[PDB]
Amino acid sequence: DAIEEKFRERLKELVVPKHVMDVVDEELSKLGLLDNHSSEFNVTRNYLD
């Protein structure tokens, strides 16, 4: 979440469309659950980036 801060803080200014905001919301919920070493975790991290 610290790494995503660099995204969030930007989002405070440039409005996030309610669609996009909900999508990043569920991805933000999923992202913490994910194991640190699964290749899917690095993939979803790069995707969320």
Partner: protein, 48 residues
């Protein structure tokens, strides 16, 4: 490769830069004429 793929290693260029250890070597692309222009991702766009 992306480094998230299994087995990813840096592209050819980085290896030459690693090898010559200077910032300004004399790269020599060889035999440009017959580069493979296929459906699997055309390098010729990558050269630009």
């Amino acid at each position: 490769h992306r480094r998230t793929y299994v087995g990813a290693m840096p592209g050819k260029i980085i290896q030459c830069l690693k090898k010559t250890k200077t910032e300004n070597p004399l790269i020599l692309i060889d035999e440009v004429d017959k580069i493979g222009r296929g459906y699997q991702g055309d390098p010729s766009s990558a050269l630009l």
